Amino acid sequence: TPLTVLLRSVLDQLQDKDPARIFAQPVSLKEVPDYLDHIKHPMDFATMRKRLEAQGYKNLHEFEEDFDLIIDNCMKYNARDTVFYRAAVRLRDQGGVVLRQARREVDSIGLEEASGLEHHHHHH
């Protein structure tokens, strides 16, 4: 469907803002045993991918909410002076540009035309 196509393109670009794959898979309790003491709703790109594949996002807003979980959880759990926190800040800022442009396109030119534009932009 057009919505899956749009969200797939957006998710691919969001992951490009995470080149070291810090957010690509769930945080492991084996490596981070106290994670769930601070984070109640873990989220990661692979989990968003699965939800996408199954048409589990009603619209862009629900998709943004999952992206926000990835960001907010990382800035909550990890202290400011860490590699994880800084990577979350870059993903928040760089991905926010992507998300606001995608919403802007859907609202102005329609979902199909936005999915077409998101599959290959001519500029950024």
Side-chain angles (χ1 to χ4, degrees), residues 21-119:
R21 296 176 173 158
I22 286 154
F23 312 96
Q25 293 292 337
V27 167
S28 168
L29 299 191
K30 195 176 180 170
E31 270 78 38
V32 183
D34 65 337
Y35 193 59
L36 301 186
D37 294 331
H38 310 265
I39 299 307
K40 193 170 166 76
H41 313 290
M43 189 44 62
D44 64 276
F45 278 142
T47 303
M48 292 179 74
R49 183 73 64 176
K50 294 181 289 180
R51 183 161 171 193
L52 184 50
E53 303 271 342
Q55 293 176 110
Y57 291 110
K58 184 194 175 182
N59 50 39
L60 192 77
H61 170 74
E62 300 194 339
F63 174 100
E64 293 166 358
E65 290 188 355
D66 271 355
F67 178 71
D68 290 343
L69 285 172
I70 301 180
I71 297 308
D72 293 343
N73 287 347
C74 188
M75 298 184 196
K76 279 174 178 192
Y77 177 81
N78 293 110
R80 203 186 71 184
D81 189 351
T82 56
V83 52
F84 306 96
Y85 192 100
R86 293 184 279 271
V89 169
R90 290 194 293 278
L91 177 60
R92 186 192 63 188
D93 291 346
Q94 295 170 6
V97 174
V98 171
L99 289 160
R100 289 185 296 279
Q101 170 67 24
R103 176 169 303 279
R104 165 182 294 267
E105 299 161 347
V106 171
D107 287 344
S108 57
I109 65 184
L111 180 71
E112 285 212 3
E113 289 283 76
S115 75
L117 190 51
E118 287 290 328
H119 225 259

